Amino acid sequence: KKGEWLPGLASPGYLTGSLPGDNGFDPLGLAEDPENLRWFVQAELVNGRWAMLGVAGMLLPEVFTSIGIINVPKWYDAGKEEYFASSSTLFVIEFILSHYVEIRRWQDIKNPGSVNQDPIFKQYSLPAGEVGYPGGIFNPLNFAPTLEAKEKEIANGRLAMLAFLGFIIQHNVTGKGPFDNLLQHISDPWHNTIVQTL
């Protein structure tokens, strides 16, 4: 039957519904063209994946710190000082590696055949067939990458991004932390809302 992001409305035509997480949601027709759609599907994946870790990375330590199990600076603060090596060195390193591993999945996107060359010696390869869903060592546990299973990944990613969007905006204006923001709201919600803050 498919899911309607909007009940009354109808889904667009290029959305077959053969895609995980498809609810007929393209009001601006960004994915009318199929190529754009493929690209966007891949993009949603990754934007969604980084957001997952990021939201998790950002949120959990804040929670644990309040519990007192450990002490770490708030995410918007990990940046200043206190690391073996400077900020610059990490960057260049981050860049070299990220540059390689991507300028990397990109090849698999244009033409799906970049699974060999592992390691430099060619003994090991990746066997499978969906873009943005690599196999092999990538999936040590071999969970069935069932369609519907993919539905869950996307939902989390979509959710993560609203959270991420929330964290950053919330940070400004608030000047505090998400968990903190939560405590303030929790302590007295009717008196703590975007309304009292803005």
Partner: protein, 150 residues
């Protein structure tokens, strides 16, 4: 940047001073509790606020005593040019992109000119918010951006 910041410019202070005295002079004829007086006192308060912001936002001033803008790209003055500009190009791009979305929707139709002099407002309202993501015009450019016939 041969100028001096406005916060520390004597000429910039003399202008705020001279302006307020001019408006205050007019204040005399109207007496106190009065409509013009409140109107003039509101201009005076609007005047103080103006100069206050310019100094507050680190804008240099010239020997003339008036702020001057740096558009070189210098980071301290993006507010002066670059930030507003990007804002513009976003809107300009928006308007143009929506305008071009309408003509393409209109082109293959009946009498195309009929909808150029009499707007299809349902269609326009459908296409206006597409400009929000107009810089994904770039992805049209990778394929169907412009006509090959010419």
């Amino acid at each position: 940047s041969g100028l001096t910041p406005c916060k520390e410019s004597k000429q910039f202070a003399k202008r705020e001073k001279q302006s307020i005295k001019k408006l205050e002079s007019s204040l005399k004829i109207y007496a106190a509790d009065s409509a013009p007086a409140l109107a003039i006192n509101a201009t005076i308060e609007k005047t103080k606020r103006r100069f206050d912001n310019y100094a507050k936002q680190g804008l240099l001033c010239g020997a003339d005593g008036l702020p001057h803008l740096i558009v070189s790209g210098d980071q301290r003055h993006w507010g002066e040019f670059i930030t507003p500009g990007i804002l513009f190009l976003y809107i300009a791009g928006w308007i143009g992109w929506v305008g071009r979305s309408y003509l393409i929707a209109i082109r293959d139709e009946k009498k195309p000119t009929q909808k150029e002099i009499i707007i299809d407002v349902p269609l326009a309202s459908r296409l206006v918010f597409r400009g929000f993501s107009w810089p994904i015009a770039a992805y049209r450019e990778l394929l169907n951006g412009e006509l090959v016939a010419k």
